[PDB]
Design a protein around this ligand. Structure first.
Ligand SMILES: CCc1c(C(=O)N2CCNCC2)[nH]c(C)c1C(C)=O
Ligand SMILES: [Mg+2]
Length: 104
């Protein structure tokens, strides 16, 4: 588990500092985004994952991956692939997938 969570801290650090991370560093404000609340049932973002890691809320690295993948599933559900947020989400999703795979 210490091995699991060490990897999680590395990959989240790397995602938080990525150029394409800007749509995911804070929760979407649904008051500012028409339709977000109706369409996205389980919002997720990097600061929520950071907060959860800080309070010890992740037991395994599979839990952590489920949150990361939820970020990018939400992104592809709500944003067009050719939108600014959609393009950034594909960059971040490919980064995470490839980085997760050269560990496990
Ligand atoms: C276009 C709105 C949007 C942002 C976004 O612009 N920001 C993230 C929140 N903090 C400020 C910047 N991020 C996402 C994942 C979305 C949507 C609708 O999926
Ligand atoms: Mg693949």
């Amino acid at each position: 588990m210490h091995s699991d969570l060490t990897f999680c801290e590395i990959i989240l650090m790397e995602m938080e500092s990525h150029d394409a991370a800007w749509p995911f560093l804070e929760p979407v404000n649904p008051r500012l985004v028409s339709g977000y609340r109706r369409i996205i049932k389980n919002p997720m973002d990097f600061s929520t994952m950071r907060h959860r890691l800080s309070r010890g809320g992740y037991t395994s690295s599979e839990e952590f991956a489920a949150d990361a993948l939820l970020v990018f599933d939400n992104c592809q559900t709500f944003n067009e692939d050719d939108s600014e947020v959609g393009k950034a989400g594909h960059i971040m999703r490919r980064f995470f997938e490839s980085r997760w795979e050269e560990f496990y």
